[PDB]
Design a protein around this motif. Structure first.
Motif, PDB file in Angstrom:
ATOM      1  N   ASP B   1       0.646  -1.316   0.082  1.00  0.00           N
ATOM      2  CA  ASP B   1      -0.037   0.036   0.140  1.00  0.00           C
ATOM      3  C   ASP B   1       0.890   1.310  -0.049  1.00  0.00           C
ATOM      4  O   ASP B   1       2.075   1.087  -0.375  1.00  0.00           O
ATOM      5  CB  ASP B   1      -0.977   0.011   1.376  1.00  0.00           C
ATOM      6  CG  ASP B   1      -1.990  -1.075   1.207  1.00  0.00           C
ATOM      7  OD1 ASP B   1      -2.549  -1.208  -0.058  1.00  0.00           O
ATOM      8  OD2 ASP B   1      -2.528  -1.733   2.068  1.00  0.00           O
ATOM      9  N   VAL B   2       0.383   2.355   0.400  1.00  0.00           N
ATOM     10  CA  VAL B   2       1.076   3.575   0.723  1.00  0.00           C
ATOM     11  C   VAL B   2       2.194   3.390   1.655  1.00  0.00           C
ATOM     12  O   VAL B   2       1.936   2.983   2.570  1.00  0.00           O
ATOM     13  CB  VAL B   2       0.340   4.982   0.776  1.00  0.00           C
ATOM     14  CG1 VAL B   2      -0.788   4.844  -0.231  1.00  0.00           C
ATOM     15  CG2 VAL B   2      -0.591   4.587   2.106  1.00  0.00           C
ATOM     16  N   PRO B   3       3.361   4.142   1.261  1.00  0.00           N
ATOM     17  CA  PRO B   3       4.495   4.063   2.562  1.00  0.00           C
ATOM     18  C   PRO B   3       4.077   4.777   3.619  1.00  0.00           C
ATOM     19  O   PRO B   3       3.396   5.764   3.302  1.00  0.00           O
ATOM     20  CB  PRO B   3       5.536   4.695   1.640  1.00  0.00           C
ATOM     21  CG  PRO B   3       5.457   4.195   0.419  1.00  0.00           C
ATOM     22  CD  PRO B   3       4.016   4.293   0.145  1.00  0.00           C
ATOM     23  N   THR B   4       4.578   4.745   4.659  1.00  0.00           N
ATOM     24  CA  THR B   4       4.423   5.199   5.996  1.00  0.00           C
ATOM     25  C   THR B   4       5.385   6.026   6.316  1.00  0.00           C
ATOM     26  O   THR B   4       6.454   5.921   5.885  1.00  0.00           O
ATOM     27  CB  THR B   4       3.883   4.343   7.118  1.00  0.00           C
ATOM     28  OG1 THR B   4       3.627   5.081   8.157  1.00  0.00           O
ATOM     29  CG2 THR B   4       5.068   3.401   7.249  1.00  0.00           C
ATOM     30  N   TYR B 203       0.249   0.883  -4.596  1.00  0.00           N
ATOM     31  CA  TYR B 203       1.277   1.775  -5.394  1.00  0.00           C
ATOM     32  C   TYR B 203       2.601   1.157  -5.384  1.00  0.00           C
ATOM     33  O   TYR B 203       2.965   0.118  -4.655  1.00  0.00           O
ATOM     34  CB  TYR B 203       1.693   3.076  -4.446  1.00  0.00           C
ATOM     35  CG  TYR B 203       0.394   4.263  -4.749  1.00  0.00           C
ATOM     36  CD1 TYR B 203       0.405   4.944  -5.676  1.00  0.00           C
ATOM     37  CD2 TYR B 203      -0.676   3.981  -3.330  1.00  0.00           C
ATOM     38  CE1 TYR B 203      -0.742   5.799  -5.574  1.00  0.00           C
ATOM     39  CE2 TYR B 203      -1.462   4.961  -3.636  1.00  0.00           C
ATOM     40  CZ  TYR B 203      -1.911   5.816  -4.541  1.00  0.00           C
ATOM     41  OH  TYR B 203      -2.809   6.734  -4.740  1.00  0.00           O
TER      42      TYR B 203
ATOM     43  N   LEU D 108      -7.082   7.998   1.510  1.00  0.00           N
ATOM     44  CA  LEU D 108      -6.821   6.867   1.946  1.00  0.00           C
ATOM     45  C   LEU D 108      -7.727   6.120   3.221  1.00  0.00           C
ATOM     46  O   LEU D 108      -7.323   4.785   3.342  1.00  0.00           O
ATOM     47  CB  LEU D 108      -5.373   6.556   2.281  1.00  0.00           C
ATOM     48  CG  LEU D 108      -3.966   6.979   1.680  1.00  0.00           C
ATOM     49  CD1 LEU D 108      -2.742   7.303   2.307  1.00  0.00           C
ATOM     50  CD2 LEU D 108      -3.959   5.897   0.591  1.00  0.00           C
ATOM     51  N   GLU D 114      -4.028  -0.057   4.628  1.00  0.00           N
ATOM     52  CA  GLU D 114      -3.465  -0.512   5.831  1.00  0.00           C
ATOM     53  C   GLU D 114      -4.326  -0.715   6.849  1.00  0.00           C
ATOM     54  O   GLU D 114      -4.478   0.144   7.981  1.00  0.00           O
ATOM     55  CB  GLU D 114      -2.496   0.557   6.337  1.00  0.00           C
ATOM     56  CG  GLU D 114      -1.515   0.962   5.145  1.00  0.00           C
ATOM     57  CD  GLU D 114      -0.007   0.113   5.071  1.00  0.00           C
ATOM     58  OE1 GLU D 114       0.244  -0.006   6.340  1.00  0.00           O
ATOM     59  OE2 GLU D 114       0.366  -0.084   4.285  1.00  0.00           O
ATOM     60  N   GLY D 118      -1.113   0.598  10.042  1.00  0.00           N
ATOM     61  CA  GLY D 118      -1.718   2.054  10.098  1.00  0.00           C
ATOM     62  C   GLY D 118      -1.276   2.777   9.028  1.00  0.00           C
ATOM     63  O   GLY D 118      -0.317   2.548   8.227  1.00  0.00           O
ATOM     64  N   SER D 120      -1.161   6.848   7.829  1.00  0.00           N
ATOM     65  CA  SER D 120      -1.082   8.301   8.261  1.00  0.00           C
ATOM     66  C   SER D 120       0.199   9.032   7.580  1.00  0.00           C
ATOM     67  O   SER D 120       1.201   8.631   7.820  1.00  0.00           O
ATOM     68  CB  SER D 120      -1.102   8.462   9.851  1.00  0.00           C
ATOM     69  OG  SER D 120      -1.169   9.748  10.205  1.00  0.00           O
ATOM     70  N   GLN D 121      -0.097  10.077   6.906  1.00  0.00           N
ATOM     71  CA  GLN D 121       0.799  10.902   6.195  1.00  0.00           C
ATOM     72  C   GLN D 121       1.165  12.175   6.882  1.00  0.00           C
ATOM     73  O   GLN D 121       1.699  13.145   6.163  1.00  0.00           O
ATOM     74  CB  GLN D 121       0.148  11.032   4.710  1.00  0.00           C
ATOM     75  CG  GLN D 121      -0.336   9.778   4.171  1.00  0.00           C
ATOM     76  CD  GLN D 121       0.877   8.966   3.803  1.00  0.00           C
ATOM     77  OE1 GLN D 121       1.780   9.505   3.403  1.00  0.00           O
ATOM     78  NE2 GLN D 121       0.535   7.722   3.894  1.00  0.00           N
TER      79      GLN D 121
ATOM     80  N   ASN H 436      10.877  -0.688   3.987  1.00  0.00           N
ATOM     81  CA  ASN H 436       9.603   0.162   3.590  1.00  0.00           C
ATOM     82  C   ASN H 436       9.310   0.225   1.733  1.00  0.00           C
ATOM     83  O   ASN H 436       8.142   0.668   1.518  1.00  0.00           O
ATOM     84  CB  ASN H 436       9.613   1.356   4.086  1.00  0.00           C
ATOM     85  CG  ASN H 436       8.141   1.893   4.780  1.00  0.00           C
ATOM     86  OD1 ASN H 436       7.520   0.904   5.307  1.00  0.00           O
ATOM     87  ND2 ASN H 436       7.633   2.890   4.319  1.00  0.00           N
ATOM     88  N   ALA H 448       7.081  10.135   2.019  1.00  0.00           N
ATOM     89  CA  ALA H 448       7.061   9.421   3.154  1.00  0.00           C
ATOM     90  C   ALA H 448       8.581   9.294   3.824  1.00  0.00           C
ATOM     91  O   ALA H 448       8.760   9.043   5.056  1.00  0.00           O
ATOM     92  CB  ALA H 448       6.518   8.094   2.774  1.00  0.00           C
ATOM     93  N   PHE H 449       9.503   9.057   2.892  1.00  0.00           N
ATOM     94  CA  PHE H 449      10.635   8.660   2.894  1.00  0.00           C
ATOM     95  C   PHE H 449      11.790   9.690   3.768  1.00  0.00           C
ATOM     96  O   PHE H 449      12.749   9.597   3.481  1.00  0.00           O
ATOM     97  CB  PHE H 449      11.571   8.016   1.848  1.00  0.00           C
ATOM     98  CG  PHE H 449      10.767   6.790   1.366  1.00  0.00           C
ATOM     99  CD1 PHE H 449      10.557   5.916   2.172  1.00  0.00           C
ATOM    100  CD2 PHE H 449      10.284   6.785  -0.081  1.00  0.00           C
ATOM    101  CE1 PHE H 449       9.702   4.582   1.517  1.00  0.00           C
ATOM    102  CE2 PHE H 449       9.380   5.746  -0.604  1.00  0.00           C
ATOM    103  CZ  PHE H 449       9.368   4.608   0.153  1.00  0.00           C
TER     104      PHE H 449
END
Ligand code: HEA
Ligand SMILES: CCCCCCCCCCCCCCCCCCCC(=O)O[C@H](COC(=O)CCCCCCCCCCCCCC)COP(=O)(O)OCCN
Ligand SMILES: CCCCCCCCCCCCCCCCCCCC(=O)O[C@H](COC(=O)CCCCCCCCCCCCCC)COP(=O)(O)OCCN
Ligand code: CUA
Ligand SMILES: [Cu+2]
Ligand SMILES: [Zn+2]
Lengths: 100, 236, 338, 124, 48, 268, 117, 535, 58, 56
Positions: B1-4, B203, D108, D114, D118, D120-121, H436, H448-449
């Motif tokens: 999914d989306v990176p955190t 993604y 999202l 997730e 979790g 969270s951005q 990640n 995010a990175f």
């Protein structure tokens, strides 16, 4: 592979044929480098060897080595109660009675 | 999914293959932690006991039983690690009945997608191209360097077989959550498979270096229900 | 799958020659042992199949070497060599039969036979002082043993855990066919010449080292080459080259040996398929008997001949016979209808 | 007595020709039967051979570990200052804002993303 | 002329210009070369 | 070491080479060659009279090395039994690396042979590329190489039995018989019907049979040097380390050719 | 350059090792063309004398300060590697005996003296 | 003219090691600064320093790789420490082929010019360290840039081949009176093994690069799929050199550590024969495993199993070496000088970096870690903390014996701690970023990175401060180096034993197990006139 | 003299006082052209590698 | 008696190998029963509540 009673004879024979201070220090250095703590007979021959070569510091440091080689303190006190006539006849004084 | 944001561990999984990868990794880290703790403890003991020591053991230099023991135990550890690895390597694949096929041609700095089925008699195969939305044209809420103008849409609980090829240079098709990573060579066809268990958006990014705009080629895969897939297909 | 079946044959064929070099004579004993028990495997292969015997042979070899470690008595060493040879014979026969079974097409068989026989040469170099008295050799050979164990474990996972008639023309009856006798005997003569050459040569190991690489290169190349070039032609050249070299250097002998082996091994199955029953397992026993008998019996005779009639005269007679073996091999081009 | 008494505070300042005289005066005094040696001679003889001078000094003193520690801390402060100076002057794209990273959360959240650990951005 | 300063390709003592200048210029050039290439390539492609 | 006047001579059997300027000059010539070749292929030079100068200077550098290596052994007299063995080890270790470059091309040939691409029809030498008949000049070359190998053993046995005329004829014939190999393989590149750039076949056929060409020109130069040095009384009946090194090279080249003739010309 | 030698008793340097010449029409012999440290070895091996010794150190007895092991050296110093009395018991210890002081081998105690030639 | 015949037209082996050292320092400083440029662009999201050029970011990465794999570690570890120490350890006055050593040195400066000129003549060579074929063609890279970078890998190959051949031929027939080939020290064995791998691995690289050059400039169609070729072939011809290479950089390090652990822990090495056999096995099994670098290209399912089985077996010999080092440090006495600190830091950091290797050898798991910063974090722990630490230990160990001048202990300790902290901060977050899902070779990354990238750009600025302090340490060594031997007892090679009196110690100071520490304060130009004798 | 000048060139290369590459009275012909042309070759590869960094072609 | 000591380093080695393995097994039995198993349990509980919603 060597036994206690062969170690404790080879080293008396070695101590009874050293002729200089270098030799006495060399033999003492690899006597305290095994798994076996030397018996009081070996130390008794070592003190006489130090007496022939006429050195005093070595006779005091041989006893300072036993405090580190021995596992506990009761053993250290047991060494000092068999090597008592030899010390009081030769004249050797321990470090903790000098405080140098 | 989306990176955190402050990530430490893997992303959430949506395929059996990724769960298998995670389980195998967690199995190996057990023995690795064991070895590291042993070595660290030995160094700690050496420092605390034998620093500036009066007695030097200069005759302990051979060993005979201990050299068998630091040569056999690592072998059995390697065998234990090797068993599940072989099971996973040979077991998980497209054993029976692939259900759908999507060709992913990787051009220079965008992707091209074809659905090999859903053809008419005249050759009207559904096809499109996926680009990247620049920073200047982003709407409110869209992710940067991961959002595309056209997205792959696939059903939930259906096998998908991706065929990867390239036309310019060596690219790489990656979607970390789905456990998909394959190469795109200039003159060969590779294939991978995936099954998706839950609905969502996944993604991905390219892997192999290909030139200037290698960092701008996102992949976006949506997993919708059967009804929504029919509605989407009846519009393209 | 098919590639894995080959790796197993490589390991099995490497092991036997690795033990030959190791000794700890005892090797002479091991070879006779093999001749004795090889014929039986034809019955076993046909009924039980190869995979059960194949992996059992490896554990029998392991328990044999464990017996080597346990007992230093000469009789115990001889018994260990006997059991070791039994396991080697079973493993070699089963591996040859199974690899023949997997690759039905002739050309693929010729391709795989060379890589299989490569381990036969590899065992010579890998383990001559294998597991010597000093522990350092055991330590050095530990990594390769681990690799063998892991690849065998892969084989076990494939075959067992996961889903993967009667022979006619008896051995004497098979010999009655001249083509079988020629094809089987060519390998035996080629090996016999070098086997007799080796002991007397140092009097008249370092020289033999290049021959190990030469055999590997020849076996790898000629397995592919034979189908296009013509299998009988490669043997015809190789046997005459071996005779020329033997009559009068180690690398050339090894390369010609590779010629003969790669030319003669796959061709046997062709004759069996064409003019006999469609059975791969039984045929390889004749070839294996030739291999073992050549080295078991004859090196002692060659050594006895040397220094009695002289090394040059023994080499001359061996080269003469080897050179004369060439005309017979021409008949192997085509078999009659049957 | 003055030549031998209190060698622990004077021994290293003497030249290399006033040390051999002491060593060669204590070498012909030890030939006598011991218990004829004064206490100061015994202490001096012990100090000269097995004592903390010359080749028995320690690698690190108490006043060297402080130096090393305060050197490393000073080395860290310079790097921190330079990194901060390079950090204030940056290119901040439009996406690095909280009001933008709250809308991405809503997107999202509509598509369940997730469900485990979790999404969270928000890092501002 | 064997000694502790006789195996080095450069002179360190009894020198007109003090050694600090040759020592420092070496490191300065070594650490400044990689920026010149970046400048050359950035000015050849428009951006600053 | 108890001989009377022994300190007047060296106490160990090795060679302390004097200072020579040849490494720097060879390095500079190679730098010039590399830069000129890297530029000339993309403009930036125009004239082709600089690359030739660079190659000439490199070759001159090797020759001027060899002059000193010959003067140190035939005139000054510093080649004991240890130095000779060291030189032999060095030459063998160079020949091994010279061989290992060929294994790479053989692997590149078998990787393209087995598994041909879809773009080409699934067939070796494909349609439109006629191979070279192996019952032609490639047969003459093999016979010539075998004869050349046979004639240089007559020279090495004609120098241990102390015959001068008998060491010169063999060397002459060997040189004049490798020149025929070079000529026969230079008039077979003009009678071909496929170029460097028509396929992967013609790109490997001219990359393993073109390096052998250069290594044969090297042999011609080496044998010319050996003849010229034997004519002037430099070789003794027990000290000739050029002949052995030039004999170990010819046999390696012959064995390589027998693999370039079974794998490239026959199999297809 | 000067008088030619015939055995290693009249060889005083590199000036006595040139040699006569070969004859026109013959393959010359090593006894007619050899100049430097080659003809020295050649002349030594034709009598039985080895010019370059390769005999390892003495491992027969230990050495006291009255009877030390003698090491011959053409210099003021020489490096000596000791391994013990039965020749492989003591680990390797390296020493530099010289003309003003003797080595003593901190493990076994063998003493080495230097003899200047 | 005495200058020219002595430092340009040279034959002595110990006068070329110094020039190798001076070259290595320069070429390491350059690459470290290029790395800093890399880390100041991956600090926060956006286009920060390089304004918008995604070219000029790949050029920096390629140059940082080449300048610091080919121009720093090999010249420092096989040039500086081999040429200077191997002859003295084996008792040889000089090497067998001196002029070849001189050419081995002098081929390098002609090679760095080409590399620096491939970054200024046009857009450059941004193909990465591994120059893959279909990208390094004439459609993406059209200029004299890739060609001039391939010609810098040809000259270095010649230099390394000549040096390795010299080492092998010197260690065989040029030994002392009583040194058989089982009484050699461990450093000599390490040099011999790395030389054998150099002989067996370089021609394949030469063939691959030359074929690529022919494809670029003469349209030969080796790697073009429109004429019948496959790019994957190049990968094979690269990685047969690729994996032996990564051991050539670590094996000379290993030997150095052994010497240190046998000096400051006054005990002989536990199992010397075991370690020679372990190095032999590590070298030999390093040629049979080269396809774990290509697991994602579409290999068979029966070829992955062999390569995943043959990669894990290497852990046995290295474990033997590590356990032997702990065993040799166990019973003896330890005194914490500046080389022993690096020796200690090697044993833990190399283990942490190599334990990451056993996770990436599985073909099943490499689907989740290929082309990701997990690999970067893996190989920096074994290269930046395994090889460079060995180099620093070797310098701090052997500099006084070569130069005759001692160094300040305190500044050395400060530099060690700074380097330790900076390197540990800079490479650990790469594991998290790899887990990640951060791809490699990307100038810009999603939002995010950011956070961990802000921590990895903080340690680089500590490592550079450590480098500047190293420069000052060298300066303080050369000037007033004779008066630095009385500050600390770190100058002493070995402390007195318990019974060994000071007076006796001052007469017999050096007790060694090799020739190295008996030679004069700078070793004499002609060191051995009358040969050394061994029992 | 005769073809055996070997016993006469062996007395000249020893006790010469010059380097062995410039001792015989023939080394001029080998050493003047070589060093003359090496200078031009090196001064032409530096004129075109600084002329190429500025983008000038021919 | 108290004047006869023979072996004391072997016992130290045995006790230092019997504590570096128990400690490692403790540090590794937390990775597998406190960081791994509950995650799998949470995941499987999640997937068996998603199916109930679809069923209803
Ligand atoms: C110079 C340092 C170095 C060294 C020594 C090695 C050697 C090893 N490397 Fe190599 N490796 C690199 C640096 C290095 N490597 C680099 C830079 C690359 C890629 C470059 C590129 O891609 O451009 C690479 C390539 C590479 C890859 C490819 C990754 C990929 O791109 O997917 C992998 C794993 O897949 C790997 C793993 C290993 C392993 C396991 C070892 C082993 O030799 C190390 C083993 C260490 C130990 C095992 C620790 C000691 C063990 C014990 C203390 C006890 C024993 C333990 C047990 C028996 C379990 N290396
Ligand atoms: C690849 C690129 C480099 C190729 C060049 C390789 C040269 C290897 C030379 C090996 C020489 C070994 C050697 O010691 O020979 C000495 C002289 O040899 C010689 O002098 C032989 C000269 C060989 C010159 C070859 C030049 C080829 C250049 C390419 C041309 C195209 C011995 O001399 P000796 O001891 O036998 O004399 C004694 C009589 N008393
Ligand atoms: C690449 C091939 C390079 C060939 C190098 C020669 C290969 C054999 C090496 C060898 O043993 O002989 C060297 C001669 O090489 C030579 O004379 C030529 C070496 C230089 C060749 C050009 C290198 C291009 C890069 C001796 O060299 P030596 O002078 O030390 O022997 C001192 C004499 N006692
Ligand atoms: Cu283009 Cu990736
Ligand atoms: Cu690798
Ligand atoms: Zn000794």
């Amino acid at each position: 592979e060597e036994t206690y009673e062969e170690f404790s004879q080879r080293y008396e024979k070695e101590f009874d044929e050293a002729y200089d201070l270098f030799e006495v220090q060399r033999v003492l250095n690899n006597c305290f480098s095994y798994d076996i703590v030397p018996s009081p007979a070996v130390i008794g021959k070592a003190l006489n060897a130090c007496r022939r070569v006429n050195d005093y510091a070595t006779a005091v440091r041989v006893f300072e080595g036993l405090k580190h080689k021995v596992e506990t303190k009761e053993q250290y006190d047991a060494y000092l109660e068999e090597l008592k006539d030899v010390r009081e006849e030769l004249g050797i004084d321990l470090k903790e009675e000098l405080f140098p | 999914d989306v990176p955190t944001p402050w990530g430490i561990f893997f992303q959430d999984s949506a395929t059996p293959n990724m769960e298998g990868i995670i389980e195998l990794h967690n199995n190996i880290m057990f023995y690795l932690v064991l070895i590291l703790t042993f070595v660290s403890y030995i160094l700690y003991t050496i420092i605390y006991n034998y620093s500036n020591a009066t007695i030097v053991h200069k005759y302990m230099n051979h060993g005979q039983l201990i050299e068998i023991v630091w040569t056999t135990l690592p072998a059995v550890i390697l065998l234990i690690i090797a068993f599940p690895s072989f099971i996973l390597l040979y077991l998980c694949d497209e054993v029976i009945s692939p259900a759908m096929t999507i060709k992913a041609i990787g051009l220079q700095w965008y992707w091209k997608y074809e659905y090999s089925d859903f053809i008419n008699d005249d050759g009207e195969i559904v096809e499109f191209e996926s680009y990247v939305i620049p920073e200047e044209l982003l709407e409110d809420g869209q992710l940067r360097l991961l959002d595309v103008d056209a997205s792959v849409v696939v059903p939930v609980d259906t096998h998908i077989r991706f065929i990867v090829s390239s036309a310019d240079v060596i690219h790489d098709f990656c979607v970390p959550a789905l456990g998909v990573k394959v190469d795109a060579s200039p003159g060969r066809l590779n294939q991978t498979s995936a099954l998706i268990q839950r609905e969502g958006v996944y993604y991905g990014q390219c892997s192999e270096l290909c030139g200037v705009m290698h960092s701008a080629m996102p992949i976006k895969i949506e997993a919708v229900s059967l009804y929504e897939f029919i509605n989407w297909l009846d519009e393209q | 799958s098919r590639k894995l079946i080959l790796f197993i044959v490589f390991l099995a064929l490497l092991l036997d020659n690795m033990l030959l070099t190791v000794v700890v004579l005892l090797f002479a004993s091991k070879a006779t042992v093999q001749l004795i028990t090889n014929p039986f495997i034809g019955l076993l292969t046909n009924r039980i199949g190869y995979p059960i015997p194949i992996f059992a042979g490896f554990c029998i070899m392991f328990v044999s070497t464990i017996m080597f470690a346990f007992s230093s008595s000469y009789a115990f060493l001889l018994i260990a060599r006997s059991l070791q040879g039994i396991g080697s014979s079973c493993s070699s026969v089963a591996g040859m039969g199974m690899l023949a079974s997997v690759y039905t097409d002739d050309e693929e068989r010729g391709n795989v036979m060379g890589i299989a026989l490569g381990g036969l040469a590899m065992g010579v170099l890998v383990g001559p002082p294998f597991g010597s008295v000093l522990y350092e050799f055991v330590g050095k050979t530990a990594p390769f043993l681990v690799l063998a164990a892991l690849v065998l474990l892969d084989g076990a996972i494939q075959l067992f855990v996961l889903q993967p008639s009667q022979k006619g023309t008896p051995l004497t009856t098979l010999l009655k066919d001249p083509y079988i006798l020629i094809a089987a005997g060519s390998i035996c003569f080629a090996n016999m010449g070098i086997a007799m050459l080796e002991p007397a040569l140092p009097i008249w190991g370092v020289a033999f080292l290049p021959a190990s690489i030469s055999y590997l290169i020849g076996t790898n190349i000629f397995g592919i080459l034979a189908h296009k070039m013509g299998r009988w032609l490669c043997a015809l050249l190789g046997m005459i080259i071996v005779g020329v070299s033997i009559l009068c250097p180690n690398f050339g002998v090894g390369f010609a040996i590779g010629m003969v082996d790669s030319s003669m091994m796959p061709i046997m199955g062709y004759l069996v398929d064409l003019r006999h029953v469609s059975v791969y397992g039984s045929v390889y026993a004749i070839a294996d008997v030739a291999f073992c008998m050549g080295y078991a019996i004859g090196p002692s005779a060659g050594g006895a001949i040397a220094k009695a009639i002289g090394f040059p005269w023994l080499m001359t007679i061996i080269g003469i016979i080897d050179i004369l073996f060439a005309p017979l091999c021409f008949f192997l081009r085509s078999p009659p209808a049957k | 007595n003055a030549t031998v008494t209190n060698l622990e505070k004077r021994w290293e300042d003497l030249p290399e020709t006033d040390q051999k005289d002491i060593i060669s005066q204590l070498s012909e005094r030890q030939k006598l039967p011991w218990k004829d040696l004064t206490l100061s001679e015994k202490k001096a003889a012990w100090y000269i051979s097995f004592g903390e001078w010359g080749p028995r000094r320690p690698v690190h003193t108490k006043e060297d570990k402080l130096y090393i520690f305060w050197g490393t801390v000073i080395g860290i402060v310079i790097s921190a200052t330079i990194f901060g100076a390079f950090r204030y002057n940056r290119n901040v794209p439009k996406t690095m804002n909280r009001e933008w990273q709250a809308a991405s959360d809503e997107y999202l959240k509509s598509k369940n993303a997730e469900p485990f650990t979790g999404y969270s951005q928000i890092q501002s | 002329d064997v000694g502790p300063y006789s195996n080095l390709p450069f002179k360190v003592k009894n020198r007109r210009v003090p050694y600090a200048v040759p020592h420092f210029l070496f490191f300065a050039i070594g650490m400044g070369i990689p920026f010149f290439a970046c400048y050359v390539q950035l000015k050849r492609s428009g951006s600053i | 070491m108890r001989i009377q006047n022994r300190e007047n001579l060296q106490l160990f059997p090795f060679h302390l080479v004097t200072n020579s300027p040849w490494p720097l000059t060879t390095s500079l010539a190679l730098m010039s060659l590399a830069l000129t070749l890297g530029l000339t292929m993309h403009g930036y030079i125009g004239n082709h009279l600089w690359l030739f100068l660079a190659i000439s200077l490199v070759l001159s550098s090797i020759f001027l090395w060899v002059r000193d290596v010959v003067i140190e052994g035939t005139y000054l007299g510093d080649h004991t039994i240890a130095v000779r063995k060291g030189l032999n080890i060095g030459f063998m270790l160079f020949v091994l690396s010279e061989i290992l470059i060929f294994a790479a091309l053989f692997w590149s040939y078998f990787h393209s042979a087995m598994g041909p691409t879809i773009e080409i029809g699934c067939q070796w030498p494909p349609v439109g590329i006629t191979s070279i008949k192996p019952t032609e000049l490639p047969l003459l070359n093999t016979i010539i190489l075998l004869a050349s190998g046979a004639t240089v053993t007559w020279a090495h046995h004609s120098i241990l039995y102390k015959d001068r005329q008998g060491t010169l004829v063999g060397l002459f014939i060997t040189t004049l018989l490798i020149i025929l190999f070079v000529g026969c393989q230079v008039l077979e590149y003009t009678w071909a019907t496929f170029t460097i750039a028509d396929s992967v076949f013609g790109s490997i056929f001219y990359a393993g049979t073109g390096l052998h060409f250069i290594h044969m020109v090297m042999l011609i130069v080496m044998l010319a040097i050996c003849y010229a040095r034997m004519y002037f009384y430099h070789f003794t009946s027990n000290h000739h380390l050029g002949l052995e090194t030039t004999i170990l090279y010819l046999h390696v080249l012959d064995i390589i050719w027998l693999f370039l003739y079974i794998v490239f010309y026959w199999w297809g | 350059q000067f008088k030619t030698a015939t055995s290693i008793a009249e060889v005083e340097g590199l000036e006595n090792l040139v040699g006569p010449g070969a004859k026109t029409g013959t393959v010359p012999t090593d006894l007619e063309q050899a100049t430097g440290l080659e003809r020295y070895e050649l002349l030594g091996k034709l009598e039985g004398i080895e010019v370059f010794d390769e005999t390892p150190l003495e491992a027969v007895r230990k050495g006291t300060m009255k009877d030390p092991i003698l090491i011959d050296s053409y210099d003021d110093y020489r490096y000596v590697g000791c391994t013990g009395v039965p020749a492989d018991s003591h680990n390797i210890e390296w020493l530099k005996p010289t003309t003003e002081k003797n080595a003593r081998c901190w493990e076994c105690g063998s003493v080495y003296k230097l003899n200047f030639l | 003219m005495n200058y020219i015949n002595r430092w340009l037209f040279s034959t002595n082996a110990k006068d070329i090691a110094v020039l190798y050292f001076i070259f290595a320092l320069f070429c390491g400083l350059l690459g470290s600064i290029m790395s800093l440029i890399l880390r100041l662009e991956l600090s926060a999201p956006g286009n920060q320093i390089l304004m918008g050029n995604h070219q000029l970011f790949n050029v920096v990465a390629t140059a940082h790789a080449v300048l610091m794999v080919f121009f720093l570690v090999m010249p420092a570890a096989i040039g500086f420490f081999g040429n200077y120490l191997l002859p003295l350890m084996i008792g040889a006055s000089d090497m067998s082929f001196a002029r070849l050593n001189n050419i081995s040195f002098w081929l390098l400066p002609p090679a760095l010019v080409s590399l620096l000129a491939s970054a200024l003549i046009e857009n450059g060579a941004g193909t990465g360290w591994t120059v893959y074929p279909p990208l390094a063609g004439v459609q993406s890279h059209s200029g004299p840039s890739v060609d001039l970078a391939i010609f810098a890998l040809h000259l270095t190959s010649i230099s390394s081949l000549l040096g390795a051949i010299n080492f092998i031929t010197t260690t065989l027939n040029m030994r002392t009176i009583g040194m058989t080939m089982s009484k050699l020290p461990l450093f000599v064995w390490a040099v011999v093994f790395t030389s054998i791998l150099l002989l067996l691995s370089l021609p394949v690289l030469s063939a691959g690069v030359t074929l690529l050059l022919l494809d670029r400039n003469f349209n030969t169609s080796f790697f073009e799929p429109a004429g019948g070729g496959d790019p994957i072939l190049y990968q094979h011809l690269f990685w047969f050199f690729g994996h032996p290479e990564v051991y050539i950089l670590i094996i000379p390090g290993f030997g150095i550590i052994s010497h240190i652990v046998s000096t400051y822990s006054k005990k002989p090495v536990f199992g010397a024969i075991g370690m020679v056999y372990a190095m032999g096995s590590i070298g030999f099994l390093g040629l049979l495993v080269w396809s774990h670098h290509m697991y994602t290209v579409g290999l068979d399912v029966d070829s992955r199993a062999y390569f995943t089985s043959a990669t894990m077996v290497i852990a046995v010999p290295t474990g033997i070496k590590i356990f032997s080092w702990l065993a040799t440090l166990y019973g003896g006495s330890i005194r914490y000088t500046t080389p022993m600190l690096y020796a200690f830091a090697f044993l833990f950091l190399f283990t942490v970096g190599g334990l990451s290797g056993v996770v990436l050898s599985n073909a099943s798991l490499d689907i989740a870690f290929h082309d990701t910063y997990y690999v970067i974090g893996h190989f920096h722990y074994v290269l930046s903390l395994g090889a460079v630490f060995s180099l620093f230990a070797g310098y701090y160990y052997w500099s006084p014996l070569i130069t005759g001048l001692y160094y300040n202990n305190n500044l050395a300790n400060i530099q060690f701690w700074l380097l330790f902290i900076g390197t540990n901060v800079t490479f650990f977050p790469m594991h998290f970023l790899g887990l990640n899902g951060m791809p490699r070779r990307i100038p810009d990354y999603p939002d995010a990175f950011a956070g961990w990238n802000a921590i990895s750009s903080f340690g680089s600025l500590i490592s550079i401060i450590s480098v500047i302090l190293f420069a000052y340490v060298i300066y303080d060594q050369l000037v007033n180096g004779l008066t630095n031997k009385q500050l600390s007892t770190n100058s002493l090679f070995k402390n007195p034993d318990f019974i060994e009196s000071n007076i006796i110690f001052n007469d017999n100071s050096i007790k060694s197990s090799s020739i190295d520490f008996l030679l004069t304060s700078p070793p004499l130009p002609h060191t051995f006139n009358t040969p050394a004798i061994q029992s | 003299t005769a073809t055996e000048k070997i016993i006469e060139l062996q007395k000249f290369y020893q006790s010469t006082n010059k380097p062995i590459y410039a001792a015989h009275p023939r080394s001029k012909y080998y050493l003047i052209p070589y060093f003359g042309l090496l200078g031009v070759s090196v001064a032409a590869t530096l004129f075109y590698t600084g002329r190429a960094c500025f983008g000038i072609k021919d | 008696s108290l004047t006869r000591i023979q072996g004391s380093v072997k016992r130290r080695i045995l006790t230092d190998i019997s504590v570096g393995l128990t400690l490692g097994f403790g540090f590794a039995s937390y990775w597998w029963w406190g960081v791994h198993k509950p995650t799998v349990a949470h995941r499987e509980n999640y997937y068996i509540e998603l199916a109930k919603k679809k069923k209803a």
